[PDB]
């Protein structure tokens, strides 16, 4: 699955934000508008016994130019929730379930 990181009309938005895969399916989370951007997930709010830093951007890592992307598999079913460290205020978040 493609996720936008920023709308098409500036929205500082994943689009999709909430969406279902497979295991092993690959995110390809791709900088579109209103970037600087990451990808972190919630180390509380994923599922037991995942590493979050096996799929998540660090913090202070970031997406700067329009294209980049970061690509991540998951496989542990269950809900992860997301988002965009310097955006998460202005809602730039999401979740994503393996099922
Ligand atoms: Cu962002």
């Known amino acids: 699955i493609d996720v936008l990181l920023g709308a ?3 929205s500082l938005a ?10 092993g399916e690959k995110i ?4 579109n508008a209103g970037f600087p951007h990451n990808i972190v997930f919630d180390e509380d709010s ?3 016994g995942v590493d979050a830093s096996k799929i998540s951007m660090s913090e202070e890592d970031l997406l ?5 992307t970061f690509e991540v598999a998951l496989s542990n079913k ?3 929730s ?8 202005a809602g730039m978040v999401g979740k994503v379930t393996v099922n």
């Open 46 to 48: 994923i599922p037991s």
């Open 82 to 89: 997301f988002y965009c460290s310097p955006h998460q205020g």
């Open 8 to 10: 098409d009309d500036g």
């Open 64 to 68: 700067n130019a329009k294209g980049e």
């Open 28 to 31: 390809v989370f791709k900088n």
């Open 14 to 23: 994943f689009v999709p934000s909430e969406f279902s895969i497979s295991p």
């Open 78 to 80: 269950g809900e992860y």
